[PDB]
Amino acid sequence: MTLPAFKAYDIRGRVPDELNEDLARRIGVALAAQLDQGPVVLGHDVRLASPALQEALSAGLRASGRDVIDIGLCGTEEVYFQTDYLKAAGGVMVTASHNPMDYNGMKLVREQARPISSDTGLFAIRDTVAADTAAPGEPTASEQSRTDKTAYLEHLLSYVDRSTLKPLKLVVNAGNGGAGLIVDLLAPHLPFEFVRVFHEPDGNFPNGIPNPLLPENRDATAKAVKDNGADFGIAWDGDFDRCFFFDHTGRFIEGYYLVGLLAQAILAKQPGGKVVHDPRLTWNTVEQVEEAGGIPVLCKSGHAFIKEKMRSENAVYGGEMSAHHYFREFAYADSGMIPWLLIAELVSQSGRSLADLVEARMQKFPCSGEINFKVADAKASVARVMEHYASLSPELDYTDGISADFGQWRFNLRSSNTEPLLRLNVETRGDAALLETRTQEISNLLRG
Ligand SMILES: O=P(O)(O)C[C@H]1O[C@H](CO)[C@@H](O)[C@H](O)[C@H]1O
Ligand SMILES: [Ca+2]
């Protein structure tokens, strides 16, 4: 067969069956043969296995003559930023994002933090590793320990005018992932009062997997916000490349509406910029980008596609409805920290709550949120939906699965590139009853 840990965008597996130290080391040797010249930046997340996997990966790399720069415990965006900042040949983050306790993985980038996908070298690494039968060589290169985050921190703060910031009260929920360490390093430079929930890094995840979409993690943050009268709350996944917002009532804000709002914040600083967005949910983003003088640029979802469209278009900002936010000045990479700094500045400067900033957008373009399906025949399921609606003549688009625009409502339906699921997203023009009917009706066609 082929190695199962090698997914489309990255390496995800169960330790030690699909991913282990010998596989990691072999990945190190194979990566040395794919990169242009320069050192390799390594980082890892809080998971229990992640240091041992990094040590193995460093050994394979140094056996093949690449210097390693170990930046230690970190979030995924720091490997991206440090790879670009230090002009390294590439970087590797050991992490399993939001996945179960027995999982780990790796995200790989080349120069300027460009992603390595199955498309673009990750499957060439897989093939090399699959065949590499050789014995581990000895380290012929060094490992430098570069744990200082000053440049990263200074970079993050540069997005906001610190003298316009009000002493807002913010709940932060790191889910025992790694985000609280960055918060605690920024706190001395910010006027905010932080209310820290599930703050300490703990790879045993005592309070559960860092995944804010799970209702127990959701309710922990929503409750902290109401109990403390915070202005809003922020929660991250384990490696904090995803950021989720809660308004002052404790209400979870669908990542879709943050794309348009962050867009407007950015185009206030860089007028006439291009903004990259995905096709799942579109109408609110397009109108807000245009209202702000920007240019909306549609792109297939998935972080490797977004980053490339942004480079090739010189887009100032890009956003997915799955809580990934991308910034040109951040090596065209995603950050889970920049978003909430931008929102904090917006609230401070406008005198508006986060709830009021999004309220009218949510009523103007209600959406279903992402709904996932395991079905028997994904093709036959999709066929049934298209059959049922063909007599209404929807405008179709195949940029990313199927988008069907009916005028007053639309949906996107697409297979996942990382799970064997169908993902559904629906939205209407200010009609919540139509939203519910069409979402139930489509759900029925899918399952039946
Ligand atoms: O499983 P999917 O939908 O193909 C890909 C999923 O993970 C990616 C990487 O975190 C995200 O960029 C994407 O928006 C998300 O839907
Ligand atoms: Ca993540």
Atom of ligand 1 nearest to the CA of 241: 10
Ligand 2 center from residue 97 Cα (angstroms): 4
Asked whether 333 and 76 are in contact (CB, 8 A), the reply is no
Asked whether 369 and 362 are in contact (CB, 8 A), the reply is no
Ligand 1 probe mutation, 254, 324, 423, most atoms within 8 A of CB = 324
- Say how far apart CA 71 and CA 92 lie, in whole Å: 11
CATH topology of domain 247-365: Alpha-D-Glucose-1,6-Bisphosphate; Chain A, domain 3 (3.40.120)
Ligand 1 probe mutation, 244, 414, 418, 423, most atoms within 8 A of CB = 418
Query: Domain 169-246: what homologous superfamily?
Result: Alpha-D-Glucose-1,6-Bisphosphate, subunit A, domain 3 (3.40.120.10)
Q: Do domains 1-147 and 169-246 have the same CATH topology?
A: yes
Asked whether 241 and 77 are in contact (CB, 8 A), the reply is yes
- Say how far apart CA 344 and CA 161 lie, in whole Å: 11
Ligand 1 probe mutation, 98, 285, 299, 303, most atoms within 8 A of CB = 303
- Say how far apart CA 72 and CA 88 lie, in whole Å: 16
Atom of ligand 1 nearest to the CA of 370: 16
Sequence-distant (6+) residues with CB within 8 A of 289 are 260, 263, 264, 267, 275, 277, 295, 296
Token pair for residue 234? 């922020």
- Phi and psi at residue 423, in whole multiples of 5°? -110, 125
Q: Which ligand is nearest to the CA of 9?
A: 1
Structural biology method used: X-ray
- Say how far apart CA 74 and CA 362 lie, in whole Å: 34
- Say how far apart CA 343 and CA 295 lie, in whole Å: 21
Q: Among residues 97, 348, 381, 403, which one is catalytic?
A: 97
Burial class (CB in 10 A: 0-12, 13-18, 19+), 204: exposed
Atom of ligand 1 nearest to the CA of 8: 4
Distances in whole angstroms, Cα of residue 135 to Cα of each of 5, 17, 285: 22, 20, 53
Token pair for residue 237? 């996944």
Token pair for residue 146? 């570069």
Residue 365 neighbours by CB distance under 10 Å: 23
Stated resolution in angstroms:
2.0
Asked whether 267 and 296 are in contact (CB, 8 A), the reply is no
Q: Is the CB of 319 under 6 A from ligand 1?
A: no
Q: Is the CB of 17 under 6 A from ligand 1?
A: no
Nearest to 300 by CA among 417, 419, 381: 417
What angle do helix axes 378-390 and 432-447 make, rounded to 10 degrees?
130
Nearest to 301 by CA among 259, 337, 341: 259
Asked whether 14 and 30 are in contact (CB, 8 A), the reply is no
SS (H, E, C) the chain: CCCCCECCCCEEEECCCCCCHHHHHHHHHHHHHHCCCCCEEEEECCCCCHHHHHHHHHHHHHHCCCCEEEEEECCHHHHHHHHHHCCCCEEEEECCCCCCCCEEEEEEECHHHCECCHHHHHHHHHHHHHHCCCCCCCCCCCEEECCCCHHHHHHHHCCCCHHHCCCCEEEEECCCCCHHHHHHHHHHHCCCEEEEECCCCCCCCCCCCCCCCCHHHHHHHHHHHHHCCCCEEEEECCCCCCEEEECCCCCEECHHHHHHHHHHHHHHHCCCCEEEECCCCCHHHHHHHHHCCCEEEECCCCHHHHHHHHHHHCCCEEECCCCCEEECCCCCEECCCHHHHHHHHHHHHHCCCHHHHHHHHHHHCCECCCEEECCCCHHHHHHHHHHHHHCCCCEEECCCCEEEECCCEEEEEEECCCCCCEEEEEEECCCHHHHHHHHHHHHHHHHC
- Say how far apart CA 252 and CA 306 lie, in whole Å: 25
Token pair for residue 364? 């103007």
Q: Where are the domains of the chain?
A: 1-147, 169-246, 247-365, 366-448
- Say how far apart CA 179 and CA 237 lie, in whole Å: 8
Specify the CATH number of the domain 366-448. Answer: 3.30.310.50
Asked whether 216 and 277 are in contact (CB, 8 A), the reply is no
Asked whether 386 and 379 are in contact (CB, 8 A), the reply is no
Q: In what order do the strands lie in the sheet with 232-236?
A: 193-197, 169-173, 232-236, 243-246, 252-253
Known active-site residue 118: no
Nearest to 277 by CA among 312, 310, 242: 310
What angle do helix axes 76-85 and 150-157 make, rounded to 10 degrees?
100
- Say how far apart CA 336 and CA 342 lie, in whole Å: 11
- Phi and psi at residue 291, in whole multiples of 5°? -60, -35
Which residue's CA lies nearest to atom 2 of ligand 1? Answer: 416
Rg value, the chain, Cα: 22
Residue showing tokens 């193995």: 56
Nearest to 324 by CA among 278, 360, 362: 278
Asked whether 104 and 91 are in contact (CB, 8 A), the reply is no
Architecture category of domain 1-147 in CATH: 3-Layer(aba) Sandwich (3.40)
Q: Is the CB of 415 under 6 A from ligand 1?
A: no
Atom of ligand 1 nearest to the CA of 416: 4
Q: Chain centroid to CA 205: how far?
A: 20
Token pair for residue 407? 């005028």
Q: Is the CB of 242 under 6 A from ligand 1?
A: no
